[PDB]
Design a protein around this ligand. Structure first.
Ligand SMILES: [Ca+2]
Length: 263
């Protein structure tokens, strides 16, 4: 049961590639622990939380409504669309699309939402406008999942993502209702069980979003804490490894267990 930093390094030793890690105090924003904090990693589906943050900003400004219904066709479906593929007749509201993109990592949902705001480049422009010049989205789904060995497109760094996530969840950037909706969507995450959630004790709160792409990218962003209240932000990224999805999941769970047991 090695310290958190020791486990992250151990993970990198076992997996190959690089493992990036950061841990923020929620209340203050102070970095409590880090490793490769400022090195770039593929974002993968974790950008989907950022996307919905931009959507909710439009809502706060009366430029969008969570209830606005969006219809799409069979042509619009891309691979992995467990939710959108079920609503070709009735379509889905902007809010349902965010739920699908965040809680199931629905690709088409994310593409539809990107259209509503003006595309990948317009998310990046939203991020620049809030203080994040590091993170960048350049492509749609599923092209952004190729994690070209050290390519800067569709990347972030552990420190930028964690900082951006923290502003989204706790800053005056979104209204209280909107920022509660965002964390609510993350809390309802359904496809990250084998990650940090598998190491979570009873009564703990967590809201998270996972990602996975090409060779052998894997990541998770999270707000978590004991007593049903989030008190820290954790961001883990991985890339470069040849290991299976199982091993990469397992290593993240063991980093999680270390984080918990040394809380
Ligand atoms: Ca190393």
């Amino acid at each position: 049961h090695p310290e958190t930093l020791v486990k992250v390094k151990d993970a990198e030793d076992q997996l190959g590639g690089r493992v990036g890690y950061i841990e923020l105090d929620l209340a203050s924003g102070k970095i409590l622990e880090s490793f490769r904090p400022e090195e770039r990693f593929p974002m993968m589906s974790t950008f989907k939380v950022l996307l919905c943050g931009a959507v909710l900003s439009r809502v706060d400004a009366g430029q969008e409504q969570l209830g606005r219904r969006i219809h799409y066709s069979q042509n619009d479906l891309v691979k992995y669309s467990p939710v959108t593929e079920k609503h070709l007749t009735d379509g889905m509201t902007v809010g349902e699309l965010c739920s699908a993109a965040i809680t199931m990592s629905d690709n088409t949902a994310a593409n539809l939402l990107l259209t509503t705001i003006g595309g990948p480049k317009e998310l990046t422009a939203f991020l620049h406008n809030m203080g994040d010049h590091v993170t960048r989205l350049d492509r749609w789904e599923p092209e952004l999942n190729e994690a070209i060995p050290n390519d800067e497109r569709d990347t972030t760094t552990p420190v930028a993502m964690a900082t951006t996530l923290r502003k989204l969840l706790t800053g005056e950037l979104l209204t209280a209702a909107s920022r509660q909706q965002l964390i609510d969507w993350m809390e309802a995450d359904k496809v990250a069980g084998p990650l940090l959630r598998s190491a979570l004790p009873a009564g703990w709160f967590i809201a998270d979003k996972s990602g996975a792409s090409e060779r052998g990218s894997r990541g998770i962003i999270a707000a978590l804490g004991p007593d049903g209240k989030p008190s820290r932000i954790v961001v883990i990224y991985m890339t470069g490894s040849q290991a299976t999805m199982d091993e990469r999941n397992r290593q993240i769970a063991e980093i999680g267990a270390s984080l918990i047991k040394h809380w």
